[PDB]
Design a protein around this nucleic acid. Structure first.
Lengths: 113, 304, 197, 203
RNA sequence: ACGAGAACAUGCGCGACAUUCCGAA
């Protein structure tokens, strides 16, 4: 799929030298927000979840600033733009699809290592 | 005599046994259904005269989303000039859709068509559930596992049959079937098997075939004639003898559970050139009540 | 004359339920066609019979309820407990959240001699699941309906405080009964006053 | 006249609890950390067997003391003893969930350790998932009153087990500071039967 | 008067044992 294509394109060292230790903070934040959404039973993302997604976006920006490998990962995978899309649509299904996309991304990145 | 189609859709899997608790049959003969009906009538304290005198029923035949299946006639079929093994297809065929019934009688069904018909049946899946008995454990013993062979139908599959009789018999059968939905049919009814819901309606699709005249007659139920009719009805016949066995399911027949007398009946699909009217035989051996075995003949005429 | 009462409802899985029966380590019993978890009616019948025998204490009432094959006193089973199938509402709820119907539980067994933990895998039905249960009570005698139903209430209470399958002394098989309806489907008996749980 | 005694209450975590499933066991439905009842029952049985006395050369759990087989059950052929204690899975309590939603805790934490070789002194790092200290679990136990005269004594044994569990861990490596828990019993009532359980207590 | 009737796939079993987030400035 798209994750397979982008990981293969960035494979040569993946995403200019990205590892799971670099991503662990973003993964923890993403799965925390995912579990908070999972516990709730609503078709729309709540206000606190929206603020947490904004915090996740700013964490994405901070991690891109910190590391070049994380920066090129974010640029190539459209994860921040996907977060913006999830915020705009405000649908739980779209958020779950984004979480599945991120999980598939990480799985493929580990697979090609 | 009005023919009513009774369609049975099964909620839970059913345990139709032939000789063992592990056997998973997909159908029951007219004997099992008639015994269930008699038990239901005794439960509801109704009269047994209509069941024992004016009810003619067929076996429980499969049906799926597309067609109703009738038993394969035991007719002499001709294959190709060198296709000796192709006959085996017609040997493995058990049920034919009604639309393809007459074609089979005329000999226009090939071996490949017979295999297609055999594989086109979508009744359900037969499985074997393994259970245990922990009653001996509390008495310093061991658990005793056993097996129950069940058969679960596909969502739009089920078992249909045809009933023939007067208006009073038809109505009494409606009440009996309504009670039988919750009594259940088959094996472990009290242990979670045999529950179904039935619908009784008219059958134009089957009245088209039951009004057909021909040179041969096909049995639609497990039947047998008395001696006088058996004298002249067995010439040029192609049949299959089935050994009807079992224990008497009754709380007042005797002290302990005992078997009933061995019976032999012609199968469904047997072809005769003489139509014999069966009866309801007694397979009781000096019991409190007479155990009945229904072997009346529901006939379907056809051209060979 | 003759009456049959239909008791439909839901069995809610309080803790992971394992009723034994591709290659899976200790798989649960399933519907052969839909491959959906089921609660066999034999399991419920046997567990309630054992609980009621413990409570009363075979006893005559157990013979009236669950039937007897004893010589001389051949008793018909008044309770027909059908298999509990995976609920459709629970099916939709589990299809949402991307949740599987069955979970895999990993357990240890620490040896009393070498202090070495032997692993073991079992399969359970997830705690969010529900099963549609259907029971038919046959009124063979009208005078014992109240006694039979109070015995059923006692058995259901014991079952709700007990497990239903697998090793429930180690936190498995806890269940709850929700009685959707108790309606007389056959006969003229009035089951409006009757209640279970 | 069958009797069942229902003991409900809270297991309060004191140090990070890790019961493996290095992730922890979670309920698939709610994705919250869980305490399997098998873990509690096994730890209690092991502690009670050690305290009461372990037969030398013992190989099976069926060779425990008669009190342990009476309480936690025995499976020996012929002498099949049904377990009186049924320890259910302890689920993440809703009060702890509300308390964790405030201050924005994740119900769980990742603890970083390392192993230092004796010779090379190389610290190989590792991570273990734990349940946060403030978390609480709803524990539910059912005691089967089979013999009247042995009820009180059995409860004494249970009390001893609890007194050993509060001084021990529950899962993972508790010799290094994990799994320490405390039991607070909300109620002990005879849920089934006419038995009088007012005087019974396990703490 | 259903190859039927009675029959808990169930009893025992800790995902546990050893492990410094440390050397360096």
């Amino acid at each position: 799929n798209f994750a397979r294509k982008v990981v293969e394109e960035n494979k040569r060292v993946l995403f200019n030298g990205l590892t799971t230790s670099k991503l662990r903070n973003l993964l923890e934040l993403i799965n925390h927000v995912y579990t908070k959404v999972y516990n709730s039973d609503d078709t729309t993302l709540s206000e606190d979840v929206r603020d947490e997604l904004e915090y996740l976006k700013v964490k994405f920006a901070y991690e891109s600033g910190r590391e070049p490998a994380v920066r090129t990962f974010i640029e190539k995978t459209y994860v921040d733009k996907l977060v913006d899309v999830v915020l705009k649509k405000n649908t739980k299904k779209i958020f779950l699809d984004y979480c599945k996309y991120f999980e598939a991304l990480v799985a493929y990145a580990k697979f090609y290592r | 005599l009005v023919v009513k189609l009774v369609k049975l859709t099964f909620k839970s899997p059913v345990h139709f046994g032939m000789k063992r608790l592990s056997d998973s049959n997909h159908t029951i003969a007219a004997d099992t259904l008639f015994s269930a009906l008699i038990i239901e009538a005794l439960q509801q304290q109704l009269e047994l005269s209509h069941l024992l005198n004016n009810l003619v029923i067929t076996d429980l035949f499969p049906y799926n989303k597309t067609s109703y299946f009738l038993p394969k006639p035991l007719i002499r079929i001709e294959g190709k000039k060198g296709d000796e093994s192709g006959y085996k297809a017609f040997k493995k065929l058990t049920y034919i859709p009604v639309e393809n019934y007459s074609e089979y009688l005329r000999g226009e069904i090939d071996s490949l068509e017979a295999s297609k018909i055999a594989e086109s049946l979508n009744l359900g899946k037969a499985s074997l559930s393994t259970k245990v008995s922990l009653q001996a454990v509390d008495h310093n013993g061991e658990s005793e596992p056993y097996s129950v062979g069940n058969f679960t139908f596909y969502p739009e599959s089920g078992l249909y049959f045809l009933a023939k009789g007067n208006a009073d018999t038809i109505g009494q059968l409606e009440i009996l079937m309504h009670a039988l939905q919750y009594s259940g049919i088959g094996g472990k009814r009290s242990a979670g098997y045999g529950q179904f819901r039935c619908t009784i309606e008219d059958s134009g699709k089957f009245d088209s075939l039951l009004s057909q005249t021909g040179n041969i007659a096909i049995l639609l139920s497990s039947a047998m004639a008395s001696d006088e009719e058996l004298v002249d009805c067995l010439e040029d016949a192609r049949y299959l003898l089935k050994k009807r066995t079992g224990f008497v399911q009754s709380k007042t027949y005797a002290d302990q559970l005992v078997k009933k007398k061995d019976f032999y009946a012609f199968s469904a699909g047997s072809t005769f050139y003489q139509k014999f009217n069966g009866k309801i035989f007694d397979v009781s051996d000096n019991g409190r009540h007479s155990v009945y075995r229904y072997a009346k003949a529901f006939w379907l005429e056809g051209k060979i | 004359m003759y009456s049959k009462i239909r008791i439909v409802g839901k069995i809610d899985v309080l803790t992971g339920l394992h009723i034994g029966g591709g290659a899976i380590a200790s798989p649960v019993v399933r519907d052969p066609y839909s491959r959906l978890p089921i609660i066999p009616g034999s399991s419920i019948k046997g567990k309630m019979r054992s609980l009621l025998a413990k409570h009363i204490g075979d006893a005559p009432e157990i013979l009236r309820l669950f039937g007897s094959s004893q010589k001389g006193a051949i008793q018909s089973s008044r309770l027909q407990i059908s298999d509990a199938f995976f609920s459709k509402a629970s099916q939709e709820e589990f299809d949402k959240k991307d949740l599987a119907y069955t979970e895999t539980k990993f357990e240890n067994t620490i040896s009393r001699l070498t202090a070495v933990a032997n692993p073991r895998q079992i399969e359970r039905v997830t705690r969010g699941a529900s099963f549609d249960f259907h029971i038919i009570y046959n009124v063979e005698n009208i005078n014992e309906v109240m006694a039979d139903f109070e015995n059923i209430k006692t058995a259901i209470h014991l079952l709700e405080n007990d497990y239903l399958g697998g090793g429930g002394t180690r936190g498995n098989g806890r269940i709850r009964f929700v009685i959707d309806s108790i309606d007389t489907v056959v006969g003229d008996f009035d089951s409006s006053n009757l209640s279970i749980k």
